[PDB]
Enzyme design. Sequence first.
Site, PDB file in Angstrom:
ATOM      1  N   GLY A   1       1.656   6.932   8.463  1.00  0.00           N
ATOM      2  CA  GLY A   1       3.036   7.284   8.218  1.00  0.00           C
ATOM      3  C   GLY A   1       4.039   6.271   8.717  1.00  0.00           C
TER       4      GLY A   1
ATOM      5  N   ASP B   1       0.097  -7.653   1.698  1.00  0.00           N
ATOM      6  CA  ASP B   1       0.525  -6.253   1.712  1.00  0.00           C
ATOM      7  C   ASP B   1       2.040  -6.176   1.888  1.00  0.00           C
ATOM      8  OD1 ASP B   1       0.532  -3.509   1.696  1.00  0.00           O
ATOM      9  OD2 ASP B   1      -0.302  -3.302   3.726  1.00  0.00           O
TER      10      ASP B   1
ATOM     11  N   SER C   1       3.297   3.139   8.082  1.00  0.00           N
ATOM     12  CA  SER C   1       3.042   2.185   7.005  1.00  0.00           C
ATOM     13  C   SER C   1       4.333   1.720   6.364  1.00  0.00           C
ATOM     14  CB  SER C   1       2.219   2.878   5.913  1.00  0.00           C
ATOM     15  OG  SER C   1       0.867   3.010   6.269  1.00  0.00           O
ATOM     16  N   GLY C   2       4.444   0.408   6.167  1.00  0.00           N
ATOM     17  CA  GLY C   2       5.578  -0.166   5.481  1.00  0.00           C
ATOM     18  C   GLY C   2       6.778  -0.437   6.357  1.00  0.00           C
TER      19      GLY C   2
ATOM     20  N   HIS D   1       0.811  -1.210   0.000  1.00  0.00           N
ATOM     21  CA  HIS D   1       0.000   0.000   0.000  1.00  0.00           C
ATOM     22  C   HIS D   1       0.848   1.264   0.000  1.00  0.00           C
ATOM     23  CE1 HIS D   1       0.198   0.071   4.525  1.00  0.00           C
ATOM     24  NE2 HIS D   1       0.049   1.370   4.334  1.00  0.00           N
TER      25      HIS D   1
END
Length: 223
Positions: free
Chosen positions: A175, A84, A177-178, A40
């Site tokens: 923020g 994801d 994320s990942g 994402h």
Amino acid sequence: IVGGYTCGANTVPYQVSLNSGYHFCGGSLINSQWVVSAAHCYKSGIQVRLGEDNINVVEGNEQFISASKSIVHPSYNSNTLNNDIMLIKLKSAASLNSRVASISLPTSCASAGTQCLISGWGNTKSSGTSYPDVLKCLKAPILSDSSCKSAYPGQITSNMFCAGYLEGGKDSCQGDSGGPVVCSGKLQGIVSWGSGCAQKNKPGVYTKVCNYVSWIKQTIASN
Ligand SMILES: NCCc1c[nH]c2ccc(O)cc12
Ligand SMILES: [Ca+2]
């Protein structure tokens, strides 16, 4: 990160910031030329920023390297967030040192109760918004799959796990994320999704990296 603490400069040497004019996602350096992040977080024009603490100040340990190729998982579904995960290859190899270092991939999956370190530059508020300049950290346990599924009926696949605190107050957030979930020196999770941040009974949901190690290794071997 809501309810965490300031990591300390370069104490999380595998943590990267993905930058497209501004920080927009975390990631994890897994060898000198490859980063793992969330699908994402996919976009064009990514510069990978290694060695960061304050993302708004050049402090002397940074390496900025553009992505040459991004590979979103073949089965990523952006509606459910199943699978994801994405790989990013760097245009040049990072110089590895004490402050820019790869994180090991797991050889075995992790169990509920394992303590992990989650990190990022995301929002530090569960209600309202404040984005930090320096890297934030949270120690959090993996939660049982049954409690994860009960928290998120109809939504948790075998490629996801929950980590954090059912009482609320401590979580990854927008923020982050990942970015990494590291347990006993292995990358076991990627910040993926959740219902808000740090809400009671709604722990963070993370991509279950151990399911993807074979795909990661074979993808690297041919790219
Ligand atoms: N636990 C963090 C989940 C997460 C990832 N990206 C997010 C964006 C907004 C948000 O409320 C939550 C998230
Ligand atoms: Ca910096």
